[PDB]
Design a protein around this ligand. Structure first.
Ligand code: HEM
Ligand code: HEM
Ligand code: HEM
Ligand SMILES: [Fe+3]
Ligand SMILES: [Fe+3]
Ligand SMILES: [Fe+3]
Ligand SMILES: [Fe+3]
Ligand SMILES: [Fe+3]
Ligand SMILES: [Fe+3]
Ligand SMILES: [Fe+3]
Lengths: 157, 157, 158, 158, 158, 158, 157
């Protein structure tokens, strides 16, 4: 069924966002494990699959509203060089992503597209959940220090 | 059955004490886990539920003696800002709490209310048990140091 | 995640509201048992634990918004002595809570803090189903007598 | 091991008041049951059995102490003539023994017979459990009418 | 159902002699055990419990008959001072009650109270089982020396 | 938890008392087996391990009171050579212990150190049940002969 | 059966040695766990029970040779104040103990009491096993350092 011409645009921008978040944590998963931190790299992995199901949902919904999901392009990817940079790249991502999901959110009701609104309500809560978790790591880290952090976050033969 | 007008007062003061200890470790459970120390925050949690069953018992006993359990007010809550302050706030609490349970204890026999006395005997042993455990943490801590302590006490993705 | 300073005072209020509720539900639990009404007593035990999870959910979130929770105080408790007074009493508490919850949800909707909004909206349903329930006991009290209602909810001497 | 002369008879008045308890309780069981009130009849029965166990512990302790248990005569029993009277009559038997037990509990403190001392401190808590129970059964009875309580404690096809 | 006045007291002397039995037996259990003779102490205990059951049946029957059980006082008990004396003293308690039971068993025949009649004809066979038992334990004792019998009935690490 | 310096010397004494007991019980274990009395031997093995837990419970607590335990020494051991001398011997040790335990509990009651008090009170029951037991073997020795008692507790050549 | 009057003396001296080793590691088990190092305190415990079965064997054997096991006295107990002192007190013990079991060993054959010799062969191998393990700890320790050591060796709520 024909859907708000703008809700779709918003849903595409969103999709460009998760798809970015996907390649970015996936790429982080593989850097952290190769650095010796396979336990945060196990998380970085599940966070990527989580974003995977996010885009899946978004594409589902667009096609519903008779739109065309632009998968073709990503936004600018951030890649840390150090554990801490990895947790910032994610934090700064989840923040941008957020600001957007609300502004898109605040639009779906105006056009009275409510299920598409509570798919932003879902995402917002997810992201914020993800924000919660990132913050704690960076508190944890800059409390016990960046090496213990890594030890705590690695594994031995 | 009508009970010593004072044993009741004592039992209420006690109740005001556990109920304080409940909100204080519960609140600590949620601060420590958000700081990255979910493993001491798992203990802080069970210690709170332990105090939960304590108040439950106290209320049971008052109502027995035909008294009126004042749940309405708590004492002054202590909240650490740092792992160590968290383990002191608890220690100083368990100490006060103790001094009291004995003085109340020493009163139940005089008025010859013995089961109410051996409910202070229970609590005293509990608290002291809890004192035992706190002390060890603060020895452990100020031996291997405050960061290892936290690492030992946290968890990774 | 630096939260809106006004959102936090609303959640802090809901906290003091729920903590209050924990206590007043838990007291009626213990009075009812001792009076005899095993059953309704067992139900108030559980509705207290209900709140126990809500008080917690509030602390969780407040802390995440960078706020500082306040368990240091609670509101005026309504403790009945008859059985109907227990039900009247709980009702009034729920109504109060819901009036607060509806208001806090609107503040959040207006700061565009949506997850707090969905907490208060999931909070409202909670209290409202509670309400539905209580209004049924009192509904049933009117019908079968303020006395057969006690026996229904009384456990036998097992 | 030779006990304090007086401890070895506090034990024997506890034995006395326990055997009467046993008889009394068991009579009510058999009464409350012929009357129609099976459930409370059954509680009445469990409680006889718990005194059976007290009696035993007392007999045991005495013999360890080199004293001679006196199961010969038992106190005057109170037998109810209605359901309401049964609980009453059982509440006084209890109030007595609890009073007895304390007075003995501290004789033991004085002669330094701390395990006897503990026995009694334990026996108190069990007679207290029973009182809290009988009281509460009176509150309930009192409030849901002494006629419905009657029926809450019956059976039909059992 | 209103019983024959006399049947409703034969039942009550059987009740009497049964409760004494119970006490007596149980005392020997606790004695025979502090002495070292655990096994016979344990038989002594099972048998207390079987009288517990007789007492009950008697109490039941009386109440059906509209009579008032009299658990108030019990017969003079015979307490042994040696293992040999315990069995002796238990053998007379038995010879008595068996004698009592028959005399009552045919009162019942005469008033036509055939189920009471049967009760007693049953109680006989159970006191007979016990006699045959105590006798036989005397034969044995008598023959393998009253010192070995002692030990055949003991335990070591139990 | 800075403990009363006098409480600690009492627990230190109980420690030396129990450590002593461990050893003397464990020696009778090994002598009895070698003499033949498998059973009573197996029992002394276990009563030694009993103490093993008490010696431990003392160390635990002392350390918690901020004290310094002393395992460096023990008291004069009583080692019998006959089987009755083993039983006599253990008795005397228990009596000694209990006299110490009763005294230490009173010191604690008076410093208002209640958990140490409840340790010594739970310690007294321990030794007293032990006593009960030993006085039964010797009780049974008097009865069946100082010789059949050995055979009872002897294991056969399996 | 009557046994070498000296093998017995040696076996008693030995017994005085294990019994010393028993109270010493048991006492160490309880100090280390109260300091926050319950995982080395779990070992210190099993090492004590191991020595328990050692004395048990020794007493068995003496009584066999128609001797009288002197349980009455212990040697001078060592008690560390710090994890490291705990691992030295044990090391110095196991060393003394050793020197002795050989000298006793070297005597059982001369008097041609061979099973009593291969009970010293057992003990020697045990002790040396125990020596092996202590050494490794003190290498491990004075390599990663005394705090990591303790962290590695403790546990959290
Ligand atoms: C009068 C005060 C309270 C009493 C008497 C009480 C009592 C209890 C009891 C008895 C249980 C578990 C039953 C069992 O398994 O044995 C329980 C569970 C629980 N309590 Fe409370 N409680 C009190 C207040 C609180 C507070 C202030 C909180 C925190 C806001 C809280 C949070 C919880 C939670 C979350 C559980 C379930 C376990 C879980 O899901 O984590 N309670 N309580
Ligand atoms: C002399 C004092 C008495 C003592 C020490 C005593 C002891 C006991 C004990 C120990 C049990 C079961 C405990 C177990 O299973 O370990 C029991 C059950 C029973 N009691 Fe007694 N009793 C006494 C007197 C009585 C009396 C007066 C009655 C009333 C008729 C009675 C009737 C029964 C019956 C019928 C049972 C079997 C119930 C069952 O366990 O299924 N007893 N008693
Ligand atoms: C002659 C001296 C001792 C001997 C021969 C001895 C022997 C034994 C043996 C053989 C076992 C376990 C049986 C098995 O499962 O294989 C044991 C267990 C035990 N031992 Fe001893 N022991 C002695 C002294 C001590 C001391 C001084 C303590 C500490 C105070 C102690 C504390 C324990 C404890 C607590 C257990 C049971 C496990 C536990 O609950 O932690 N023992 N002993
Ligand atoms: Fe997302
Ligand atoms: Fe507590
Ligand atoms: Fe709620
Ligand atoms: Fe009782
Ligand atoms: Fe019979
Ligand atoms: Fe002991
Ligand atoms: Fe060794």
């Amino acid at each position: 069924m024909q859907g708000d011409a703008k809700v779709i645009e918003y849903l595409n921008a969103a999709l460009r966002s998760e798809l970015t978040a996907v390649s970015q944590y996936w790429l982080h998963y593989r850097l952290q494990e190769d650095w010796g931190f396979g336990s945060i790299a196990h998380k970085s992995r599940k966070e990527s699959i989580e974003e995977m199901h996010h885009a899946d949902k978004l594409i589902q919904r667009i096609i519903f509203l008779g739109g065309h999901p632009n998968l073709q392009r990503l936004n600018p990817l951030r890649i840390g060089q150090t554990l801490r940079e990895t947790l910032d790249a994610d934090l700064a991502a989840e923040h941008d992503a957020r600001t957007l999901y609300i502004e898109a959110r605040d639009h779906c009701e105006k056009v009275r597209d409510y299920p598409s609104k509570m798919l932003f309500e879902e995402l917002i809560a997810d992201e914020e959940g993800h924000i919660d978790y990132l913050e704690t790591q960076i508190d944890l880290m800059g409390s016990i220090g960046e090496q213990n952090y890594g030890m705590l976050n690695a594994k031995p033969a």
